[PDB]
Amino acid sequence: LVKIVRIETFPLFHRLEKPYGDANGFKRYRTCYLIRIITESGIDGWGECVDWLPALHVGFTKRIIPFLLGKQAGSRLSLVRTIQKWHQRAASAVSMALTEIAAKAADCSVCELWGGRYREEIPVYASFQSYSDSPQWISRSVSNVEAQLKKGFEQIKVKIGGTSFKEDVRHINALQHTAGSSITMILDANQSYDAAAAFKWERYFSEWTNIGWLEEPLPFDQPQDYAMLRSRLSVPVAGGENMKGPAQYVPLLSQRCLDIIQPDVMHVNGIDEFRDCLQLARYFGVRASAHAYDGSLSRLYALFAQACLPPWSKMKNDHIEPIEWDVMENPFTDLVSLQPSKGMVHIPKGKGIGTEINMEIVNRYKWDGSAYE
Amino acid sequence: LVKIVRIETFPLFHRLEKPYGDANGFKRYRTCYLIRIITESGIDGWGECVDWLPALHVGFTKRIIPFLLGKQAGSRLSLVRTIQKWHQRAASAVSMALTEIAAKAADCSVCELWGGRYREEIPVYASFQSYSDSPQWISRSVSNVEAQLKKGFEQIKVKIGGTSFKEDVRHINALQHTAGSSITMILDANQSYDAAAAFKWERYFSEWTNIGWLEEPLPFDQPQDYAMLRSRLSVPVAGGENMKGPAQYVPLLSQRCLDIIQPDVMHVNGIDEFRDCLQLARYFGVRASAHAYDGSLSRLYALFAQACLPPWSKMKNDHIEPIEWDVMENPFTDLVSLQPSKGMVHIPKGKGIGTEINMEIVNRYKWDGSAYE
Amino acid sequence: LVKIVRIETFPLFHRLEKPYGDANGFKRYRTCYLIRIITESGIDGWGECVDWLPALHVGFTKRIIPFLLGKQAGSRLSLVRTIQKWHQRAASAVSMALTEIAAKAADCSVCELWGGRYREEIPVYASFQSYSDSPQWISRSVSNVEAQLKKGFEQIKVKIGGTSFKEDVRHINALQHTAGSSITMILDANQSYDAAAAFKWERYFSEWTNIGWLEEPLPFDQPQDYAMLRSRLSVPVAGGENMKGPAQYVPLLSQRCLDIIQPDVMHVNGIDEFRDCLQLARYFGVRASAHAYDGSLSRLYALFAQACLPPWSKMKNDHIEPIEWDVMENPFTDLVSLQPSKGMVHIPKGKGIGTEINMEIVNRYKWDGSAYE
Amino acid sequence: LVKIVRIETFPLFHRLEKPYGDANGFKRYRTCYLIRIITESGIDGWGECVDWLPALHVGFTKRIIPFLLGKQAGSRLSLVRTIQKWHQRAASAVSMALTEIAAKAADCSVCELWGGRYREEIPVYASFQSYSDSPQWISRSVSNVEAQLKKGFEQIKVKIGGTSFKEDVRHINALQHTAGSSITMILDANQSYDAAAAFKWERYFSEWTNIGWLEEPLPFDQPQDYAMLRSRLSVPVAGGENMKGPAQYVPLLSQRCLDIIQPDVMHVNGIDEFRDCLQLARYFGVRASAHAYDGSLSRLYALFAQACLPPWSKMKNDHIEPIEWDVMENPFTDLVSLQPSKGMVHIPKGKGIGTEINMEIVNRYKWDGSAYE
């Protein structure tokens, strides 16, 4: 029954050396917002969220923190529920810090808190923001992908739908010729297309044997269009990274819209809601591969969640979905000291989250408090 | 700490002084099967299941126990999932025992283990096996109901569908005149009917203001008949107590078959799958009221689960569903010293399950090993 | 392995003393066509069909009999299958004679041949052809119904849809006032109506408590209209007496068109196909009440079939559907000596069909071979 | 004549010399449970079921046998329906025994009891448990298949879905090169996949001309996923071996889920319910090919049933579906002395089941009462 006594906030900001992006445009910076909740006993817990920092920082300092102080850290479901009404993304960060506190007070790991892992290794794919601001963007993308293939990644994700079909195809072709067919390739459209535009890829999908899935080809306004497209393509369709929770997945799965859902710990209403998304997928007989582009601490929670997820198939060697691993310039990957080895992540087994937040990163990237174009 | 070293079994049996029943026939006895899992550190936990005792006992002693000895008690998800292949009922009892151990090892209650409760009290309804083997069965039922109303139950469930509509209407009318409109009445058909037979009640549902729901009017073979009937009645329709897990509820809910689902901790694959049933209902926007007719220790788990469930409505004093409380002759109701007052059950707050199994009852009703019927 | 050696035919004809009818018009005569198949061993079997006698008699004498002679009586499925291609109604008669032969050669009853009865008593309703050729048709119908109520029939079927709604209502009202609410009344429209015309009865159905079902309100060209109407009425909808077999029921049941199907032994492809219709209904969760207006020997087979049918409900006193019992002038009711007693028929238990064909009737009503307006 | 006076039980057990399996894991032993029901007159009959022997044996000796003693053997429908409540598996064995008794008492074969056969020979396919515990599992499977092809099997079934697509394709390719296009190949996934995983085979189904069907690609939780996948593949889809009866097939067929249903005599509620499964398929216009992997005496019943089934097509030499023939190490294949020649099984024509249970095998493999695994 140990009360919350203090909460520290760490808005983080990093201007990118070279911009990159996807169909929505070029990213110029990366941000992160960490929280540390400290209880009466001294047991503490960390959380992570990502949103526009001026608005996010006041959400915490002016409303969430004053609410949380003096509250019972153990009333996790209740506290996260009430905060969800003010800022959903903040709510996810709080849910992480409170889970860490719980696991520590219980003297166990987070996976143990959840009833024990099924496995201690989780596959990851290298996730690229393939567009850059250069006429030579295709050759640079090819070089970047080659670099990561050297590291033993066997699965990659790259961007499409930001330029004409003809030009995207040239890019994908160039990657096929370097990577070869033993590398699995995922193509992310970031909702650029309509059904007919997406379908133009089918003639290539008919030939290629190494396409993992087609990701977010369409916006979600018309679920029936997803069901339509899915039944026409020769590769799996994934999506849903901007869904807010299990309730929003339910009708997409009832309508047979997707082969793979992709909840993001930070977009849904916290880690328990996130785990419910994964289970929902299992119950509907569909796959789940977390979106985690902006995560590091949150990404570790997605890995814990995957480790506690039952197999999706009876294939001895192919029965757990990979998680997204951002491979672009981003110092926040080091907030936790955990990296893949040959496309595989080994789950920390220690108490709480089994690892520590890298304070050098926290300190180096302290946000200067200013508005950032 | 938690390696499993010993498992004790307690088959229990009670011959009824006076038989009672429902549309499936008369119950002649009650049974219960308790297990006590003991770990290396001495931390123990209890589970309960119910099935025909000769076959259940051999399943534990010859398959389940030999498998569990030497296993790590904290690998709850994994172990339950493995046992679920040989025996779902057994897996449920195992899940409960492992949950108690987990909470004890964590030095918290089961509800705190799950992220903390939303509330401290849960409503219950008095559940009756209304039919007796007697021409005077209606008068008897009336007397039985009046007895429980004196204890301040505000909601009851009684049986229909075992005899002609005309005679069942006589029974219900008699109850209506004695209990009056302050008392909520739940009618349970136990799958006796087809849509047209069930629909005959509508002309009375048109007049009455105090029907809680119509329970299991039909078998579940044809889900579409449920959606059809639902749209025709003036009262909610509940069921699904014999569904084996959340995956079985999914198509029913996608098809808008039920107003209320009624999972049973002992019929689904364990306490975590049971809790997933309740979450699934919430995400589909349907109500969830646990079936708990057999069961005492499993009934306690159903109450913990309901305490950790967010509200179903925004009504200040009508936003959590009741749980079933068997009010018929059954000594196993005392296995756990928890009873409702004025139709409300206060949830135990102490470490583990916050209560002790009554060894007096366990010893008194030891099954003597004889086969029955 | 006993061959068919001889087959005798008995076209029967009876001019009605006073014509009666339904929405299709007045019946002026009744006909019956009996067959007797005799095997090498002397074991014989009877069958019954009903169709226009000139065409039916040549179907037998010129094609079916010459086919059947020298065939193995025991190859029932095969022989009935092949004859179905020439004349379906004849095929039913053959299937009956061959079943009788089988039961006799096996030294058991027909019910035993089928794996034993569930019960030995079957409820029947008195079935009226309510229209007569008189301004006083309502008073005569009232008198006819009163006469049968004296015999202890508790359920009746009468005709509607042959005249304006206003006039039919006057007739039904007159019957309600004599019979009272302890008599169950069935209303047969013989496909007179469209959805809107049928629905006009709903205002009366809203008031009456003793309506068994509404029978064949619409033609079957548009199954969706049945599904539509069923969901709007306050009484069950029955039909399907002109369906040719199980395959034709399947889509009506998949579309939730009917509460009760009504196969006719003589319209479907013989008795095994007929029993399959009954089982199909059970599997779809719907009721089955045989059409049997023109049957006597065939009616007995419908009774055997009902006796071998599992209950439709869990109601101790209401779990088997009645069969149709023609109560109009018709000497062929006496072809077999079996009559209801207070609305209940007791199934003959003896070997073969447990009864004999009444040869006095066969002889008295020999068809004179002439065309009959 | 047929009062039941004695019932003898024969649990049987065989430890495999070399384990084999499918995507669910490796089989280590085979079991069989035979019953012999003896009537007052000395007429007896046999039944077979398969389940975990300690629990199955107690179910018979303590519940089923005590119920049957003194009952009339000719009340087959009733007795089977009562037993179906305690134990479906047991009811199946009981149904078989009572059917043999019925046919014997009738002095005819089982097929004649059912109305006579349509045909005297039924095609079978060699069914393999393709996976072995060995790096050389592919070569072994190839050798095993070649061995059976030498016996003139023209159709085989092999296992997929237990390992990665890539490795399963290697296995199937190896089989294709050895067996060639004259041999029909059936691929059985044992519910390993989701739709997208199953659909990966389509690019090979596009090339191959000799695939019989794809068996159980998916679990049956979401029927709509089957209809979806069916419309995308170039080969028929079969399944349903774990459906409990015709009522469970109805929604699958209404929804156009399957090209082929695969009832199992021992998994449904008896031989009459099994035959209803096959009839249901015919009325829905779908194919029916019995699952018979375990079973020898029950396999014989499946063959009798198929001999009494009308053709599925109008193709002179391709109008009856094959039945499964287990070709793996299993001494219980000889319990009944019936084997295929050149992939065809000739149906026994003699009274009762036309054959004797091999008491040498029954005695050799007597279960010693020890619990296993």
Q: What is the largest CA-CA distance in chain B?
A: 62
Q: Is A114 close to B254, i.e. CB distance below 8 A?
A: no
**Nearest in space to B295 (alpha carbons), one of B141, B96, B147:** B96
3-state helix, strand, coil in chain D (%, to 5): 35, 25, 40
Buried b (16+ CB within 10 A) or exposed e, C205-216: eeeeeebbbbbb
Find tokens 């002084």 and name the residue: B17
CB within 8 A of A278, min separation 6: which ones? A263, A288, A305, A306, A309
User: Which pair of tokens denotes residue B32?
Assistant: 């219960």
In this structure, what are the phi and psi dihedrals at residue A304, rounded to the nearest 5 degrees? -55, -45
Q: Closest approach of chain C CAs to the CA of B159, in angstroms? A: 12
Q: Show which of residues 139-178 on chain C sit within 8 Å of chain D, judged by CB atoms.
A: none
Residue D355's alpha-carbon distances to A315, B11, D104, D118, in angstroms, are: 42, 44, 12, 20
Find tokens 């029909």 and name the residue: D184
CB within 8 A of C222, min separation 6: which ones? none
**Strand C4-22 to strand D25-39: parallel, antiparallel, or no bridges (unpaired)?**
unpaired
* Helices C137-150 + C165-179 axis angle, to 10: 30
Q: Is D161 close to A315, i.e. CB distance below 8 A?
A: yes
The CATH architecture to which C108-373 belongs is Alpha-Beta Barrel (3.20)
By residue count, chain A amounts to 373
How wide is the angle at C-alpha C128 spanned by C-alphas C127 and C131, nearest 5°?
160
CA distance C366 to C362: 6
CB within 8 A of B88, min separation 6: which ones? B244, B267, B268, B269
How many CA atoms, within 13 angstroms, populate the side-chain half-sphere of residue B8? 9
How many CA atoms, within 13 angstroms, populate the side-chain half-sphere of residue A313? 24
By the 8 A CB rule, do B123 and B157 touch?
no
D231 at A interface, C-beta within 8 A: yes
CB within 8 A of B50, min separation 6: which ones? B31, B32, B33, B89, B266, B294, B295
Q: Which of A107, A115, A117 sits opposite B272 (nearest CB)?
A: A115
**Strand C344-346 to strand C121-127: parallel, antiparallel, or no bridges (unpaired)?**
antiparallel
Residue A102's alpha-carbon distances to A80, A107, A111, B109, D137, in angstroms, are: 14, 8, 12, 12, 48
Neighbour-count burial of A5, counting CB atoms closer than 10 A to its CB (0-12 exposed, 13-18 middle, 19+ buried) = middle
Residue C159 annotated as catalytic: yes
By the 8 A CB rule, do C332 and C29 touch?
no
User: Which pair of tokens denotes residue B219?
Assistant: 């078998």
Q: Which of the residues of A are catalytic?
A: 159, 291
Q: Is B77 close to A105, i.e. CB distance below 8 A?
A: no
D81 at B interface, C-beta within 8 A: no
> C159, C244, C267, C316: which one is catalytic?
C159
**Nearest in space to D229 (alpha carbons), one of D250, D201, D208:** D201
DSSP A212-281: EEEE--S-SS-HHHHHHHHTT-SS-EEE-TT--SHHHHHHHHHTT--SEE---TTTTTSHHHHHHHHHHH
DSSP D57-123: HHHIIIIIHHHHTTSBTT-HHHHHHHHHHH-HHHHHHHHHHHHHHHHHHTTSBHHHHTT--S-SEEE
Other C-beta atoms within 10 Å of D367: how many? Answer: 18
How many CA atoms, within 13 angstroms, populate the side-chain half-sphere of residue A324? 30
Buried b (16+ CB within 10 A) or exposed e, A163-175: eeeeebeebbeeb
Which of C72, C118, C253, C283 to substitute to test the interface with D, most D CBs within 10 Å? C283
CA distance A75 to A57: 24
CA distance B307 to B113: 13
Other C-beta atoms within 10 Å of D295: how many? Answer: 26
Q: Show which of residues 252-281 on chain B sit within 8 Å of chain C, judged by CB atoms.
A: none
- End-to-end Cα spacing for chain A: 45
**Nearest in space to C309 (alpha carbons), one of C325, C288, C338, C340:** C288
Which of D283, D349, D351 to substitute to test the interface with C, most C CBs within 10 Å? D283
Contacts of B310 in chain A (CB under 8 A): 77, 81
CA distance A241 to A260: 11
Q: Closest approach of chain B CAs to the CA of D167, in angstroms? A: 26
Q: Is D373 close to B63, i.e. CB distance below 8 A?
A: yes
Helix (H, G, I), strand (E, B) or coil at A170: helix
In this structure, what are the phi and psi dihedrals at residue C97, rounded to the nearest 5 degrees? -55, -45
Q: Is C76 close to D116, i.e. CB distance below 8 A?
A: yes
Other C-beta atoms within 10 Å of A19: how many? Answer: 17
CA distance D236 to D231: 9
CA distance D316 to D313: 8
Find tokens 């909610």 and name the residue: B236
CA distance D91 to D37: 13
Other C-beta atoms within 10 Å of D355: how many? Answer: 15
DSSP A45-113: EEEEE-S-HHHHHHIIIIIIHHHHTTSBTT-HHHHHHHHHTT-HHHHHHHHHHHHHHHHHHTTSBHHHH
By the 8 A CB rule, do B68 and B37 touch?
yes
CA distance B299 to B282: 20
C186's enclosing H/E stretch is strand C184-188
Neighbour-count burial of A57, counting CB atoms closer than 10 A to its CB (0-12 exposed, 13-18 middle, 19+ buried) = middle
Q: Is B76 close to A308, i.e. CB distance below 8 A?
A: no
Contacts of B222 in chain D (CB under 8 A): 250-251
How many CA atoms, within 13 angstroms, populate the side-chain half-sphere of residue B111? 24
- End-to-end Cα spacing for chain C: 45
User: Which pair of tokens denotes residue B199?
Assistant: 């629909």
Contacts of B190 in chain C (CB under 8 A): 314
Residue C291 annotated as catalytic: yes
Where do the DSSP E strands lie in C40-85? 44-49
Q: Is there a binding annotation on residue D241? A: yes
> Running DSSP on this structure, what letter comes out for residue B22?
E
By the 8 A CB rule, do B53 and B87 touch?
no
Neighbour-count burial of B83, counting CB atoms closer than 10 A to its CB (0-12 exposed, 13-18 middle, 19+ buried) = buried
In this structure, what are the phi and psi dihedrals at residue D352, rounded to the nearest 5 degrees? 70, -130
Give the resolution to one decimal, in Å: 1.8
For chain D, state the CA radius of gyration.
20
By the 8 A CB rule, do A4 and A70 touch?
yes
How wide is the angle at C-alpha A337 spanned by C-alphas A332 and A6, nearest 5°?
70
D302 at C interface, C-beta within 8 A: no
Find tokens 């092999």 and name the residue: D158
DSSP D194-249: -HHHHHTTHHHHTT-S-EEEEE--S-SS-HHHHHHHHTT-SS-EEE-TT--SHHHH
By the 8 A CB rule, do B245 and B226 touch?
no
C303's enclosing H/E stretch is helix C297-307
Residue C143's alpha-carbon distances to A343, C175, C235, C341, in angstroms, are: 90, 9, 26, 20
CA distance C286 to C260: 6
Q: Where are the domains of chain B?
A: 1-107, 108-373
In this structure, what are the phi and psi dihedrals at residue B4, rounded to the nearest 5 degrees? -75, 125
Homologous superfamily assigned to B1-107: Enolase-like, N-terminal domain (3.30.390.10)
CA distance D85 to D91: 9
Helix (H, G, I), strand (E, B) or coil at A308: coil
CA distance B124 to B37: 30
C68's enclosing H/E stretch is helix C65-68
Query: Which sign, positive or negative, has the C-alpha torsion B118, B121, B123, B128?
Result: positive
Q: Is B107 close to A108, i.e. CB distance below 8 A?
A: no
How wide is the angle at C-alpha C65 spanned by C-alphas C59 and C69, nearest 5°?
165
CA distance D112 to C77: 10
How wide is the angle at C-alpha C358 spanned by C-alphas C356 and C361, nearest 5°?
160
**Nearest in space to C274 (alpha carbons), one of C121, C49, C108, C4:** C49
Residue A118's alpha-carbon distances to A310, A317, B88, D113, in angstroms, are: 7, 14, 19, 54
By the 8 A CB rule, do D180 and D208 touch?
no
CB within 8 A of A166, min separation 6: which ones? none
CB within 8 A of D117, min separation 6: which ones? C75, C77, C78, D111, D304, D307, D308, D347
Q: Which residues pair with C237 in a beta bridge?
A: C214
Distance, C-alpha A260 to centroid of its chain: 14
CA distance D329 to A120: 37
CB within 8 A of B129, min separation 6: which ones? B20, B21, B22, B27, B159, B328
